[PDB]
Design an enzyme around this catalytic site. Structure first.
Site, short mmCIF file in Angstrom:
data_model
loop_
_atom_site.label_atom_id
_atom_site.label_comp_id
_atom_site.label_asym_id
_atom_site.label_seq_id
_atom_site.Cartn_x
_atom_site.Cartn_y
_atom_site.Cartn_z
N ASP A 95 1.13 4.93 2.19
CA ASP A 95 0.71 5.64 3.39
C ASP A 95 1.14 7.08 3.35
O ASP A 95 2.25 7.38 2.89
CB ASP A 95 1.30 4.97 4.65
CG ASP A 95 1.05 3.49 4.78
OD1 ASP A 95 2.02 2.73 4.74
OD2 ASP A 95 -0.07 3.11 5.15
N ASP A 110 0.82 -1.20 0.00
CA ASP A 110 0.00 0.00 0.00
C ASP A 110 0.86 1.27 0.00
O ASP A 110 2.09 1.19 0.02
CB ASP A 110 -0.91 -0.03 1.23
CG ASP A 110 -0.30 0.40 2.55
OD1 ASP A 110 0.94 0.29 2.71
OD2 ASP A 110 -1.06 0.88 3.41
N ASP A 113 -3.57 4.57 2.67
CA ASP A 113 -3.92 4.98 4.02
C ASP A 113 -3.54 6.43 4.22
O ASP A 113 -2.41 6.82 3.94
CB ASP A 113 -3.28 4.11 5.11
CG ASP A 113 -3.60 2.63 5.02
OD1 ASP A 113 -4.70 2.28 4.51
OD2 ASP A 113 -2.77 1.83 5.48
N1 LIG Z 1 -2.05 1.21 13.64
C1 LIG Z 1 -0.85 1.48 12.98
C2 LIG Z 1 -0.73 1.25 11.56
C3 LIG Z 1 0.48 1.55 10.94
N2 LIG Z 1 1.59 2.03 11.67
C4 LIG Z 1 2.92 2.35 10.98
C5 LIG Z 1 4.18 1.55 11.39
C6 LIG Z 1 4.49 0.77 10.09
O1 LIG Z 1 5.80 0.74 9.52
C7 LIG Z 1 3.42 1.19 9.08
C8 LIG Z 1 2.39 0.03 9.11
O2 LIG Z 1 1.44 0.01 8.04
P1 LIG Z 1 2.25 -0.72 6.84
O3 LIG Z 1 2.24 -2.24 7.06
O4 LIG Z 1 1.66 -0.18 5.40
O5 LIG Z 1 3.76 -0.10 6.79
P2 LIG Z 1 4.74 -0.44 5.62
O6 LIG Z 1 4.47 0.69 4.54
O7 LIG Z 1 6.03 -0.39 6.39
O8 LIG Z 1 4.43 -2.01 5.09
P3 LIG Z 1 4.71 -2.66 3.55
O9 LIG Z 1 6.03 -2.19 2.97
O10 LIG Z 1 4.81 -4.27 4.00
O11 LIG Z 1 3.52 -2.33 2.41
O12 LIG Z 1 2.88 2.43 9.51
C9 LIG Z 1 1.42 2.24 13.05
O13 LIG Z 1 2.34 2.69 13.74
N3 LIG Z 1 0.22 1.98 13.67
ZN LIG Z 2 2.92 0.75 3.42
ZN LIG Z 3 -0.70 1.21 5.69
#
Ligand SMILES: Nc1ccn([C@H]2C[C@H](O)[C@@H](COP(=O)(O)OP(=O)(O)OP(=O)(O)O)O2)c(=O)n1
Ligand SMILES: [Zn+2]
Ligand SMILES: [Zn+2]
Ligand SMILES: [Zn+2]
Ligand SMILES: [Zn+2]
Length: 353
Positions: A197, A195, A277
């Site tokens: 963010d 995704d 997100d």
């Molecule tokens: N309730 C939440 C949701 C998200 N996050 C933060 C910490 C993470 O690094 C990221 C989590 O959502 P993701 O899994 O999309 O983050 P990534 O972009 O790191 O994951 P990916 O690369 O696997 O798409 O944002 C957080 O602190 N609390």
């Molecule tokens: Zn992400």
């Molecule tokens: Zn996310």
């Protein structure tokens, strides 16, 4: 001496121990699925520390002095050194419960409870679940199944940037002074992600203007026919509460229609469904939100553990509280948070723990 904390290590995308870490990540994922949180944590900490190493492990002697490497983890490392494979990880990959839980939870809207329910009903494929006439699906799962192929395909940087343009264009229409920052994996330098963010903040918006932005932006996209899915979670943030899922900033979980003409890459239906997100935070908490949403998940866990167990401080995505001084510590940047904690600054691309 390598620290036991990821927040005291530099972890770049230059992994020399992927043979060990891929195996440890599978064992950690299986323990997560089997609800064994303790064993999951032990494998995640071991995988994390190996990811930080500037060299590949080639003998058991190489593991001396490295923290978070218990006897179970050292047996796994020893087995991989032996024949280049993990017999434990290989058995997990072939386990029917693991395979079903990975496959079912790969659907947007399907968690551990629904995956377990379907497995115990005797389902093993998404085709048999989707075609079943007795099963009832949530609106999230309906979207998860309808846009499945697009959402299981990884989002690349040209796509993430095309989404960033859409978000910025929409947001500045209602709040022209707003600051929009891409967070998550892409901010840590990743080439792909599940995704995209974003963190949105405005130095002049009121409490009500801040509340209404996500509603105005998503209504605009709904009118444009770009909103494929939308779930807005109202803020539960309390300005003066002490710093796990209950307290949070206003956010929304979306699926956007990304037209191919908007993507500037070197390369069907002419569009791709993308998970997006959006997070809205008050201007004064923008450093805490940015630090929390940049990740990685392991870096965040160790930052909070270090703050509590080493500096008697309480950290989360909204604030930093000093229990000894009995005061909240302010920050205009991530650097100021690291300085309050007594930590050397770790760049976003060095937080891939
Ligand atoms: N309730 C939440 C949701 C998200 N996050 C933060 C910490 C993470 O690094 C990221 C989590 O959502 P993701 O899994 O999309 O983050 P990534 O972009 O790191 O994951 P990916 O690369 O696997 O798409 O944002 C957080 O602190 N609390
Ligand atoms: Zn992400
Ligand atoms: Zn996310
Ligand atoms: Zn909080
Ligand atoms: Zn171009």
């Amino acid at each position: 001496k390598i620290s036991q904390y990821a927040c005291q290590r530099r972890t770049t995308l230059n992994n020399y121990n992927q043979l060990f870490t891929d195996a440890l990540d599978i064992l950690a994922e299986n323990d997560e699925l089997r609800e064994n949180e303790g064993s999951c944590l032990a494998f995640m900490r071991a995988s994390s520390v190996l990811k930080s190493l500037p060299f590949p492990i080639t003998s058991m002697k190489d593991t001396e002095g490295i923290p978070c490497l218990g006897d179970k983890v050292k047996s796994i490392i020893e087995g991989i050194i032996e024949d280049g494979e993990s017999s434990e990880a290989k058995a997990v990959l072939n386990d029917e419960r693991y395979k079903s839980f990975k496959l079912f939870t790969s659907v947007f809207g399907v968690g551990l409870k629904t995956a377990e329910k379907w497995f115990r009903m005797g389902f093993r494929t998404l085709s048999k679940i989707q075609s079943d006439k007795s099963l009832r699906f949530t609106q999230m799962q309906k979207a998860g199944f309808l846009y499945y192929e697009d959402l299981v395909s990884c989002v690349n940087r040209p796509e993430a940037e095309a989404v960033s343009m859409l978000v910025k264009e929409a947001v500045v229409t209602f709040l022209p002074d707003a600051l929009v920052t891409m967070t998550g994996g892409f901010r840590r330098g990743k080439m792909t992600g599940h995704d995209v963010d974003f963190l949105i903040t405005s130095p002049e918006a009121t409490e009500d203007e801040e509340q209404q932005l996500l509603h105005k932006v998503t209504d605009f996209w709904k009118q444009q026919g770009l909103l494929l899915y939308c779930d807005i979670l109202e803020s539960t943030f309390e300005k003066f509460k002490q710093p796990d899922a209950l307290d949070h900033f206003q956010k929304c979980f979306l699926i956007l229609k990304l037209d191919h003409g908007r993507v500037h890459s070197e390369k069907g239906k002419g569009w791709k469904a993308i998970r997006v997100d959006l997070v809205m935070c008050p201007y004064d908490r923008r450093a805490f939100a940015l630090l929390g949403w940049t990740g990685s998940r392991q870096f965040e866990r160790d930052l909070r553990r270090y703050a509590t167990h080493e500096r008697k401080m309480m950290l989360d995505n909204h604030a930093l509280y000093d229990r000894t001084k009995r005061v909240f510590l302010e920050a205009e940047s991530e650097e100021e948070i690291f300085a309050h904690l007594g930590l050397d600054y770790i760049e976003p691309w060095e937080r891939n723990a």
